[PDB]
Amino acid sequence: AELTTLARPYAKAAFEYAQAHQQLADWSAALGVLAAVSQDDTVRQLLKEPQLTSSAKAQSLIDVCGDKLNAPAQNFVRTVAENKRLELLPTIAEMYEQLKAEQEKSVEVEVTSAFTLSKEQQDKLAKALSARLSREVRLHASEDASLIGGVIIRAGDLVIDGSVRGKLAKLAEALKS
Amino acid sequence: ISEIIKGRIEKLDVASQARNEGTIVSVSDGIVRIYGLADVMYGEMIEFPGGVYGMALNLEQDSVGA
Amino acid sequence: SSGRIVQIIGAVIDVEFPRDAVPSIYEALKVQGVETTLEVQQQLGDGVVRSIAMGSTEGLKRGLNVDSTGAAISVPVGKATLGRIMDVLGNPIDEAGPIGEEERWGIHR
Amino acid sequence: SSGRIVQIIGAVIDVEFPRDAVPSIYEALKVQGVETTLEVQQQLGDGVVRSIAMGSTEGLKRGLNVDSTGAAISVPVGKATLGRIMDVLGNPIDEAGPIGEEERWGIHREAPSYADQAGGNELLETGIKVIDLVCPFAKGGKVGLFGGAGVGKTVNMMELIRNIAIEHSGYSVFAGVGERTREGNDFYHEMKDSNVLDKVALVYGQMNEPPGNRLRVALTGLTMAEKFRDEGRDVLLFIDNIYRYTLAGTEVSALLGRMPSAVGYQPTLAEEMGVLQERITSTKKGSITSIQAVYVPADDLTDPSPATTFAHLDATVVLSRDIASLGIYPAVDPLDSTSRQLDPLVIGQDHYDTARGVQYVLQRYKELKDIIAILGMDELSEADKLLVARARKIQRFLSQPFFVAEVFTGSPGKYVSLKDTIAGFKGILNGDYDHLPEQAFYMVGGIEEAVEKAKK
Numbered sequence: 001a002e003l004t005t006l007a008r009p010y011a012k013a014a015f016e017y018a019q020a021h022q023q024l025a026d027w028s029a030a031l032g033v034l035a036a037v038s039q040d041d042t043v044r045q046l047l048k049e050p051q052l053t054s055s056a057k058a059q060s061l062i063d064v065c066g067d068k069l070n071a072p073a074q075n076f077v078r079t080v081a082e083n084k085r086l087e088l089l090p091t092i093a094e095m096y097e098q099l100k101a102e103q104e105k106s107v108e109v110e111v112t113s114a115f116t117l118s119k120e121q122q123d124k125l126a127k128a129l130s131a132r133l134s135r136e137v138r139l140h141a142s143e144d145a146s147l148i149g150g151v152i153i154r155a156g157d158l159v160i161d162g163s164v165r166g167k168l169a170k171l172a173e174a175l176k177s
Numbered sequence: 178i179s180e181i182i183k184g185r186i187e188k189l190d191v192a193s194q195a196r197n198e199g200t201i202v203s204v205s206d207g208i209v210r211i212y213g214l215a216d217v218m219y220g221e222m223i224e225f226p227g228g229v230y231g232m233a234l235n236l237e238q239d240s241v242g243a
Numbered sequence: 244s245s246g247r248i249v250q251i252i253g254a255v256i257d258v259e260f261p262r263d264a265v266p267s268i269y270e271a272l273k274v275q276g277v278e279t280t281l282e283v284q285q286q287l288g289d290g291v292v293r294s295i296a297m298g299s300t301e302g303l304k305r306g307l308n309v310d311s312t313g314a315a316i317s318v319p320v321g322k323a324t325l326g327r328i329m330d331v332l333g334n335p336i337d338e339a340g341p342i343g344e345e346e347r348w349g350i351h352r
Numbered sequence: 353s354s355g356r357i358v359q360i361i362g363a364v365i366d367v368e369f370p371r372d373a374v375p376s377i378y379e380a381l382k383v384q385g386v387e388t389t390l391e392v393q394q395q396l397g398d399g400v401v402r403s404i405a406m407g408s409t410e411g412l413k414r415g416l417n418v419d420s421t422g423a424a425i426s427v428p429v430g431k432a433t434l435g436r437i438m439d440v441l442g443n444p445i446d447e448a449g450p451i452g453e454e455e456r457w458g459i460h461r462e463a464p465s466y467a468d469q470a471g472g473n474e475l476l477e478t479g480i481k482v483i484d485l486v487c488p489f490a491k492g493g494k495v496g497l498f499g500g501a502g503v504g505k506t507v508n509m510m511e512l513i514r515n516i517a518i519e520h521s522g523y524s525v526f527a528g529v530g531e532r533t534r535e536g537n538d539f540y541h542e543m544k545d546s547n548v549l550d551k552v553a554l555v556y557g558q559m560n561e562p563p564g565n566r567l568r569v570a571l572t573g574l575t576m577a578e579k580f581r582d583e584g585r586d587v588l589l590f591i592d593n594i595y596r597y598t599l600a601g602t603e604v605s606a607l608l609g610r611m612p613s614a615v616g617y618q619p620t621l622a623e624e625m626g627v628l629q630e631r632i633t634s635t636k637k638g639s640i641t642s643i644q645a646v647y648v649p650a651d652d653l654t655d656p657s658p659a660t661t662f663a664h665l666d667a668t669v670v671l672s673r674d675i676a677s678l679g680i681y682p683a684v685d686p687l688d689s690t691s692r693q694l695d696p697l698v699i700g701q702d703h704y705d706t707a708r709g710v711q712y713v714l715q716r717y718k719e720l721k722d723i724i725a726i727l728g729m730d731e732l733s734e735a736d737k738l739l740v741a742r743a744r745k746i747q748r749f750l751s752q753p754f755f756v757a758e759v760f761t762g763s764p765g766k767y768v769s770l771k772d773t774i775a776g777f778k779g780i781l782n783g784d785y786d787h788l789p790e791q792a793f794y795m796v797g798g799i800e801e802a803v804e805k806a807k808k
């Protein structure tokens with residue numbers, strides 16, 4: 001099954017507890033640290049040993065993280081270990097932010113221009129995108145030298161392309177169809 | 178992440194296991210599942226304690242079925 | 244050592260033991276509160292073994308303690324068995340008292 | 353870039369590549385150190401591809417580096433392939449050193465378009481009485497030799513090769529798919545000793561080879577025939593058993609993560625068959641004439657594999673185990689065999705009437721057989737007694753001694769022309785031979801040899 005399918009219950013549990021106790025930022029930091037630690041080659045290997053018990057694996061992950069996990073996050077790590085799901089922590093961390101973003105009414109937009117970075121350009125597009133989405137927008141601009149001129153805006157599954165390369169694609173299919 | 182989290186790991190006692198050795202995980206109906214035999218070739222012979230020998234048939238991702 | 248019933252499905256029972264005390268295949272196990280006998284069929288990993296009950300499982304529950312006997316089901320053999328009726332575990336079922344056995348043999352050879 | 357083996361299970365191997373360097377479907381991969389080729393069949397996701405080995409996996413391990421070749425299996429094509437024996441990868445499997453190729457084609461290709469098909473009814477004579485009568489073949493047509501185990505598929509094909517390929521002025525491709533290695537050796541020495549090896553390309557993938565080899569051998573042989581067709585030439589393509597291509601897909605289908613369908617077959621049975629069969633055709637550039645032997649599991653013609661094959665062929669020749677069990681060869685069923693050429697406009701009214709006349713007598717005899725078994729022969733009408741005698745003569749006049757079967761019978765081979773066949777059957781139906789015993793017609797040739805045999 002899709003890692004997202006297996007991680008959905010755990011991510012939703014973390015979010016519904018975090019929201020009801022005013023901890024939406026503490027859990028964000030804890031899940032991000034747990035994901036990183038588990039991905040390390042030495043920790044990866046330790047977590048796949050037949051000699052260690054579920055509690056021993058869980059404990060080892062809490063000691064490396066330390067202060068970064070609050071009491072509740074420590075209990076969540078044990079629950080994930082007891083169920084043998086410690087290979088899903090990066091996915092649980094990703095899905096938690098998505099639930100939180102819909103709650104805070106925000107989107108992490110991924111703008112890709114043809115050789116340009118400017119505050120005048122960003123604030124001119126961010127008001128229209130914020131108005132259209134009805135959410136706060138966290139632009140993450142980048143460079144795409146591939147484009148002749150223009151910009152491609154990615155937000156969720158929505159993709160607004162206003163690049164000349166897109167006009168060339170349209171012109172090419174029109175002639176052969 | 179932090180220099181602190183980068184530390185502690187050298188005191189976790191993970192060590193290592195030779196690529197030519199592994200450990201038995203389960204025993205059922207003449208089939209044995211082994212963890213750690215990274216250098217096994219399909220059809221190769223595996224040596225167990227007591228002079229018992231096996232033949233590697235399933236070289237799956239994280240387990241060898243002998 | 245002593246294990247805990249972790250799963251029950253009909254006649255089949257799973258028992259968890261300490262990693263240094265896991266019973267071998269065909270080893271006989273006894274449930275502490277009912278004295279029901281179990282025969283180990285396979286080792287599943289994590290100290291867990293799967294067994295078949297040598298009696299009824301009605302009334303058994305998860306968390307009950309289980310004792311490993313260190314040997315397979317052993318039954319009385321020789322002249323003392325003649326003219327007597329016995330069950331699967333070698334117990335007399337003819338109401339004529341105990342069997343005058345000199346030795347017992349395991350049932351797997 | 354470079355990949356690592358992550359999972360070996362039988363003939364199926366998974367290889368993990370950088371997520372920016374995932375090889376294409378049907379792309380060929382090479383294992384480092386070991387001499388093994390893997391073809392990508394599926395892209396599971398996360399840079400991993402599922403592939404099938406074109407060799408053995410006994411020497412393979414987890415972690416071996418695999419190289420992407422950027423293309424599908426490329427085999428040598430053209431004049432350099434004539435008089436040579438080759439494997440699925442196109443490597444020479446004869447001791448005559450390397451092949452001087454001037455071009456390599458990819459085994460995977462699209463079928464010719466609907467506008468490229470060509471229609472022709474030129475009658476091709478075979479020299480066999482039963483076929484020339486009820487299954488007249490056509491130049492550029494598709495022929496299928498359907499039959500179970502031990503009824504004559506190889507023998508009949510060898511006789512055709514001899515009565516057609518040897519005389520054929522153009523080139524020829526012979527593909528041994530899931531064949532016995534002994535038959536391949538006998539045929540190679542036969543083409544070499546007959547001096548005809550110079551105009552025949554030989555591709556062999558026998559039963560001792562891994563599933564992947566038996567799954568692509570047919571595409572290799574067909575790729576060589578397509579190069580010759582596209583040059584404007586007339587080509588002959590002989591396939592020893594096309595069932596082994598379907599079976600290799602059944603053997604590997606479950607390990608590829610596909611749920612099974614009816615009679616434990618791959619769910620892609622009809623598409624995998626259509627993708628191969630639509631390339632074996634005669635276009636407007638050149639003409640491929642093809643003969644395929646089709647194995648019938650447990651003699652059951654309703655089995656999904658044989659049943660899906662009939663629609664792809666122009667001429668369908670059916671071999672019967674019940675006829676072979678009576679010592680009658682060729683064991684062709686004249687009531688189940690059929691051809692698109694069996695039409696009055698194409699073969700003429702005399703031939704067509706003689707063929708339908710023979711089929712009518714044999715169908716009527718099939719329903720009188722049970723009557724004769726229970727009650728007896730005297731309880732039949734005078735018309736039925738006469739019809740039963742002629743049916744038994746026609747059934748024996750369809751047997752024929754073959755030149756490729758002299759080691760099995762001890763009797764010399766015979767070649768009957770279409771004129772002689774029609775005359776012999778028209779005579780038996782008319783009554784011109786109601787005095788000769790039924791044993792005089794068994795294993796003879798033309799109708800004159802039955803007349804000579806009767807006296808002795």
Ligand SMILES: Nc1ncnc2c1ncn2[C@@H]1O[C@H](COP(=O)(O)OP(=O)(O)O)[C@@H](O)[C@H]1O
Binds near residue numbers: 505507682757760
């Ligand atoms: N035309 C024939 N004449 C004599 N014997 C034949 C003939 N065809 C088949 N046979 C018998 O059967 C064998 C041929 O079977 P084969 O052609 O290999 O069948 P298949 O390919 O259908 O398995 C011969 O060895 C012989 O014993």
Ligand SMILES: [Mg+2]
Binds near residue numbers: 505506
């Ligand atoms: Mg054959």
